[PDB]
Amino acid sequence: PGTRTSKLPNGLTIATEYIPNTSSATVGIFVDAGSRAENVKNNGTAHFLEHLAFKGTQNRPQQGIELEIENIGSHLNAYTSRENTVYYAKSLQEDIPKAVDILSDILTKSVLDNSAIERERDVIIRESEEVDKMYDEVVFDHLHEITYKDQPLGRTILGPIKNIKSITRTDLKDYITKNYKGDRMVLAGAGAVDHEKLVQYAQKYFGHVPKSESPVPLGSPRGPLPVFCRGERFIKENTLPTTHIAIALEGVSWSAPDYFVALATQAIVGNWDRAIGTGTNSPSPLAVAASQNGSLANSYMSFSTSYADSGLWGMYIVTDSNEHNVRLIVNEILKEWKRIKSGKISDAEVNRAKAQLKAALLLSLDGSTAIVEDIGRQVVTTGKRLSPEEVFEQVDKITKDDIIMWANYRLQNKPVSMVALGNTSTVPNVSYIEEKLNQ
Amino acid sequence: ARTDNFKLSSLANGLKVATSNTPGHFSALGLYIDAGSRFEGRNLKGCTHILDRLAFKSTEHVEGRAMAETLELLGGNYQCTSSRENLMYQASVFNQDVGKMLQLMSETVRFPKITEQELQEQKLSAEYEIDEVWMKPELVLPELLHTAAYSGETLGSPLICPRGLIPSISKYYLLDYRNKFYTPENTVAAFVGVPHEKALELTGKYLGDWQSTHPPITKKVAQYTGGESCIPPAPVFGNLPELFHIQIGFEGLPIDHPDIYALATLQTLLGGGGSFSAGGPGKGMYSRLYTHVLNQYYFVENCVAFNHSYSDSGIFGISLSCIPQAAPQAVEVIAQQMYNTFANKDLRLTEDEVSRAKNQLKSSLLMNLESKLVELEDMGRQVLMHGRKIPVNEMISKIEDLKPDDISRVAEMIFTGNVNNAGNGKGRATVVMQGDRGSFGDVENVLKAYGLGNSSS
Ligand SMILES: [Zn+2]
């Protein structure tokens, strides 16, 4: 009942949650790594590895991995975030071990054939051009760049085209060697899974992994805390029909005591879309203003992003490049944040926000896959897994006061960074925003 | 039945109550009504959709606003949807909130108010929805497929309401539909993670005194006819490529038919998809449609096997999208694949093919069932249809015991037009397409040229 944990001699943590009445499961290997482990010349490597992991190992050629997973009905997937590298598998309970085997094989015994490494350069470029068509992604990548100026968190995951063209097999093996340590990874499982047996298999297939020479517990400070840099980047592009704006202030990290309060406040402001509304029976004053007299924008979305040692919290706005004066919708958003800071919020909207949050965090932990996702990310970035019941409790206890406090600390006399893409002429300055906000 | 912790019983008014699984992090519950577009006839066309769009609005004992707000406070994880054979109200909620959610559901199911204003809103909005639906090929083709497979009756009665029929959907017709289908004896209350005892308490408390209206029985068996139809080419946008589409199918099997697992295996063995197919290993790239079609012809941007299985009939076949230039080849490409499943002595279904298809089928069923909401819906519909929930063990076994000949036998039965369902269907193929009709050639001639279908009764 709950999440069982075991540590391997090399430092690798095994976290598990058994799900009664199931005959399938998910197992994933999470590594404290991702793009934040790269440097300016290194940038883009972790993602490159992600792609090559399915190309062949010292034990299985590409088509051997594919055909092997498909004959038993399993699934193999991977992704790279700024914080982690994750490979995971879904399979019938009978195949859990074969699963662990393949995951280890792919993560640590990958061939990294030079031919493959070259053919892939083009695939990554194509991928890069596709993201360039997702304006929200573009804005947030730029936001990270200026907010975390010249820091690890400030680099994108794909990396610059320049690097996508210069990454060498040496870079790849170096990244592997430097980052793949037992004390820096978590093998998470859920569904029809025996914790004891999975630990054995972990030892068997992942035991050969090097320990760091300076082991630190999964949730301990990497080193110097990232620092939030105030700034602005206006990216003029008059061909775009819509303009995109992201406004952020330093947020909360995964382990912050006020983490849930930050999410609760995000839910209190919420989202809005010119056509769809708020997704709520009763709209905030912001949503109402947004929709009035012709509309002030096309949509807005509150966001809160967390990392182990930092976080960003703010608003993403999309406007009509020809019809909207961005300044007007920004005014309303700041007014809404000030409404919260001033305490003018009902018990009802606080309760609504807490209910929304609880649901978003808990009713979504449905399959073994979503659960493994929660186990793995929590342990690998925090050192522990707060249980669904613990999380419920953390949200349930939030008060109107906690929220007012949090907004006054985070949204008063604090630095803000901003990025705008499109018809930039109507977008207000960062010092303008701080002036109105702190005012 | 057993490991399921599945329990079933009925209230005096005939309402079945089904529970399964054990306590967990939260619960799921829903009300299932044996209704759907296949029961509308011509008189109640579009009533199913409007009622589901009307779900959870004001009721006799709960104002609209209060209903909305209480549902938000419950987490907002609820929905009402309907299809050809279903109409369901479902939600997942925290354990302590089951009773309150059941109450709200029974309110909207038993005492909806349906004010002039609420109805006018859903109607206005339905017109916009219909206009949008007709622009999506993934939705239109299957609609044309069903309409032609049953000549516009029962399973082929339009799932997408004719736009011009929306304005005449009156409260009177909505009441007529409710008085025919919303009866305790035509309903199932299901719960996942709720003790059977508690479920019976809550159910009797909110639905126990509900009484039948004893309406005229109007449920016709589906009669497969087969048929052809073609709609004009879609408008050419910007950088998007122009594609023609064709779907070719034959009557399939009822979901509880003995060879259904064999048939699902055939579907998995054929597999297919889009020429893009994003995702890591396990996606099914070693399925015949990928191997013999997608990888061979790229003038083909999509090729997949479909298996619509309902209570008394089904449609099994292959879907293909291609560049206008290749249209002339579509029919034959599809016919060949169907033929190669049983009539080609040199392309017989292999042990490897069948073994892999089998495992992938077991896999997707079991994995989908990891979700409470899915366990819930599957349980509700099964009980609604034959008052019993097949245990997992049984399902797995029946699949593991399949052998190549099983799959080959079923393939031949289907593509030969030799299925004998209650509706006693024709062995005629259903061919539906979008593009210039001429571009597809003599369709019936190619299918006959391949021994597909059946011409003599
Ligand atoms: Zn990629």
Curated annotation (Swiss-Prot), chain A:
Binds 1 zinc ion per subunit. It is found in: Mitochondrion matrix. Zn(2+) binds at H47, H51, E127. Changing S110A: Loss of catalytic activity. No effect on the binding to MAS2. One of its GO terms (molecular function) is metalloendopeptidase activity. Disruption phenotype: Simultaneous disruption of the mitochondrial presequence protease CYM1 results in synthetic lethality in respiratory conditions. The modification Phosphoserine is found at S220. Binding to MAS2 is required for catalytic activity. Inhibited by high levels (> 1uM) of zinc. Inhibited by metal chelators ethylenediaminetetraacetic acid (EDTA) and O-phenanthroline. The keyword DNA repair does not apply. Changing R377A: No effect on catalytic activity. Changing K341A: No effect on catalytic activity. One of its GO terms (biological process) is protein processing involved in protein targeting to mitochondrion. Its cofactor is Zn(2+). Its EC number is 3.4.24.64. Changing K211A: Loss of catalytic activity and loss of binding to MAS2. Keywords: Hydrolase, Metal-binding, Metalloprotease, Mitochondrion, Phosphoprotein, Protease, Transit peptide, Zinc. InterPro entries: Metalloenz_LuxS/M16, MPP/UQCRC_Complex, Pept_M16_N, Pept_M16_Zn_BS, Peptidase_M16_C. It catalyses: Release of N-terminal transit peptides from precursor proteins imported into the mitochondrion, typically with Arg in position P2. Coiled coil: none annotated. Catalytic subunit of the essential mitochondrial processing protease (MPP), which cleaves the mitochondrial sequence off newly imported precursors proteins. Preferentially, cleaves after an arginine at position P2. Present with 1360 molecules/cell in log phase SD medium. Belongs to the peptidase M16 family. Heterodimer of MAS2 (alpha) and MAS1 (beta) subunits, forming the mitochondrial processing protease (MPP) in which MAS2 is involved in substrate recognition and binding and MAS1 is the catalytic subunit. This is Mitochondrial-processing peptidase subunit beta. The lineage of its organism: Eukaryota, Fungi, Dikarya, Ascomycota, Saccharomycotina.
From Swiss-Prot, chain B:
One of its GO terms (cellular component) is mitochondrion. It is found in: Mitochondrion matrix. The keyword Magnesium does not apply. One of its GO terms (biological process) is proteolysis. Keywords: Mitochondrion, Transit peptide. It holds the Pfam family Peptidase_M16_C. The keyword Transit peptide applies. One of its GO terms (molecular function) is endopeptidase activator activity. Present with 31400 molecules/cell in log phase SD medium. Substrate recognition and binding subunit of the essential mitochondrial processing protease (MPP), which cleaves the mitochondrial sequence off newly imported precursors proteins. Belongs to the peptidase M16 family. Heterodimer of MAS2 (alpha) and MAS1 (beta) subunits, forming the mitochondrial processing protease (MPP) in which MAS2 is involved in substrate recognition and binding and MAS1 is the catalytic subunit. This is Mitochondrial-processing peptidase subunit alpha. It comes from Saccharomyces cerevisiae (strain ATCC 204508 / S288c).
